[PDB]
Amino acid sequence: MKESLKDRIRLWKRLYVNAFENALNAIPNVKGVLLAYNTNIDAIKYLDADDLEKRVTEKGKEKVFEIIENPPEKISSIEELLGGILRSIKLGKAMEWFVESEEVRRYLREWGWDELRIGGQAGIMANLLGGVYRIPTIVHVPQNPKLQAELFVDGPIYVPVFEGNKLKLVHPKDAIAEEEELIHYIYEFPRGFQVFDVQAPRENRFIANADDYNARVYMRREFREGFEEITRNVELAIISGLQVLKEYYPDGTTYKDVLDRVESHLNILNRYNVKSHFEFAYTANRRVREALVELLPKFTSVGLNEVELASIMEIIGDEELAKEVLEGHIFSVIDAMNVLMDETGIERIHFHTYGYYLALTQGGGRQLAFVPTKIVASPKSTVGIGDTISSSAFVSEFGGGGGVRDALLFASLAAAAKAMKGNLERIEQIRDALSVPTNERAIVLEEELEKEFT
Numbered sequence: 031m032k033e034s035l036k037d038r039i040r041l042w043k044r045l046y047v048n049a050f051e052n053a054l055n056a057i058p059n060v061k062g063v064l065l066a067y068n069t070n071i072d073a074i075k076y077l078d079a080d081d082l083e084k085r086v087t088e089k090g091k092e093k094v095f096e097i098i099e100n101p102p103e104k105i106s107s108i109e110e111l112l113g114g115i116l117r118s119i120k121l122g123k124a125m126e127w128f129v130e131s132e133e134v135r136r137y138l139r140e141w142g143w144d145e146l147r148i149g150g151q152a153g154i155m156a157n158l159l160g161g162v163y164r165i166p167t168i169v170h171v172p173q174n175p176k177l178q179a180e181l182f183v184d185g186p187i188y189v190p191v192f193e194g195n196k197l198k199l200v201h202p203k204d205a206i207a208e209e210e211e212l213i214h215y216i217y218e219f220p221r222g223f224q225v226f227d228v229q230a231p232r233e234n235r236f237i238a239n240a241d242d243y244n245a246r247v248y249m250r251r252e253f254r255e256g257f258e259e260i261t262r263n264v265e266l267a268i269i270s271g272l273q274v275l276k277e278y279y280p281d282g283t284t285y286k287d288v289l290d291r292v293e294s295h296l297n298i299l300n301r302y303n304v305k306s307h308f309e310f311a312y313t314a315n316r317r318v319r320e321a322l323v324e325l326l327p328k329f330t331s332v333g334l335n336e337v338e339l340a341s342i343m344e345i346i347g348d349e350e351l352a353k354e355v356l357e358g359h360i361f362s363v364i365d366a367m368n369v370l371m372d373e374t375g376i377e378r379i380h381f382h383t384y385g386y387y388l389a390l391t392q393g394g395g396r397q398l399a400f401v402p403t404k405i406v407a408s409p410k411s412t413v414g415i416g417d418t419i420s421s422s423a424f425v426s427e428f429g430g431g432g433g434v435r436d437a438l439l440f441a442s443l444a445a446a447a448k449a450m451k452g453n454l455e456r457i458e459q460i461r462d463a464l465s466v467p468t469n470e471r472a473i474v475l476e477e478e479l480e481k482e483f484t
């Protein structure tokens with residue numbers, strides 16, 4: 031190891047410690063955070079070979095096996111449910127099919143689960159920002175039956191409720207309603223899991239989606255009739271869930287009907303000077319993706335990864351640039367970030383990939399910030415890491431957390447902490463992430479930015 035690299039390692043160790051100190055002092059200064067729109071329930075079942083074989087045999091083995099080779103990508107019956115699970119096994123492929131049959135939803139609910147967990151980008155961040163970081167959080171919960179409400183951790187997590195004509199903020203467990211359970215059934219299996227002659231080449235999971243409301247970005251009445259009152263209680267907002275929108279719906283609805291409401295919420299937010307952050311998850315429909323780019327000028331910040339940025343370059347960049355962004359080639363990434371800012375004029379773009387983060391901010395000149403991250407060799411959990419990175423950096427920076435790069439450093443600690451411990455309970459635990467070595471390949475990469483850029 032050359033001394034030029036040993037010194038950089040020493041420097042980044044100090045920056046990480048100071049970035050964590052700064053974040054601990056600024057996070058308490060955030061008046062409140064608004065989180066919308068997607069919250070649901072995640073039901074995890076660890077598949078048992080015998081149980082699954084009994085259920086396949088009971089419903090018709092040939093029917094289920096017919097489906098494996100002729101998948102319908104839409105669960106209309108119990109045999110299509112089992113056939114889809116077995117196909118995810120055979121291929122070791124991550125799959126998710128929508129459940130359009132009430133009868134099998136009863137079968138799913140009856141079949142049960144091993145672990146029950148909050149879902150939706152807005153939901154998981156309510157437990158993080160509110161439960162761990164202790165920031166007053168207002169979260170949008172489309173449907174809040176008892177099963178949904180109990181999944182929020184203790185802390186300053188609130189939902190709006192109407193007391194006749196007044197709006198009140200209460201913990202989700204105190205605002206239970208006779209509403210639908212929005213459950214995503216997640217069936218996990220390891221490598222080697224065998225059912226009849228079907229053996230998994232790798233670990234993976236099959237998801238039976240039984241949630242009609244988040245699929246349409248349903249908004250509950252309190253958020254449509256009391257948004258202004260809600261906005262007065264928050265300083266920041268993080269928006270998500272819009273990646274699902276279809277161009278047309280059976281009842282005649284379009285994506286534009288939902289984005290009209292979203293645009294009205296942004297107008298209210300900007301009127302109160304609330305800083306907003308959009309989570310630009312991969313949006314299959316190209317036209318909806320185009321409308322979301324057109325809506326970014328009303329956002330303060332946007333967060334995305336190599337897949338999501340490459341997907342956006344497919345419609346405002348060139349195919350070659352997208353293919354390089356997808357692989358994390360930093361220079362192509364920087365270009366794509368400037369192309370996105372040129373197209374939208376947004377104030378802040380936060381890019382995260384394996385090894386390093388980037389933040390392009392503008393105001394008095396475009397300024398680029400770069401940090402090498404902390405990679406865990408064997409994560410205990412990998413779900414919600416991306417939301418944790420975007421939310422942590424956004425709340426830390428705009429909380430007065432020490433600047434853009436310091437906010438990225440904190441997000442890198444929060445990501446590493448969640449990975450090595452699985453689930454975070456209090457912010458003090460993130461301190462343990464300081465011991466995770468900083469990615470040296472990314473540290474050396476910064477030398478290339480210092481040559482090209484001056």
Ligand SMILES: Nc1ncnc2c1ncn2[C@@H]1O[C@H](COP(=O)(O)OP(=O)(O)S)[C@@H](O)[C@H]1O
Nearest residue numbers: 335382383384405406414415416417445446449
């Ligand atoms: N081992 C490990 N340790 C710490 N952090 C990690 C690790 N592996 C990946 N990452 C980060 O998580 C992101 C993957 O989540 P994505 O961007 O897909 O968002 P999601 O919400 O889907 S997890 C990816 O961009 C990385 O910056």
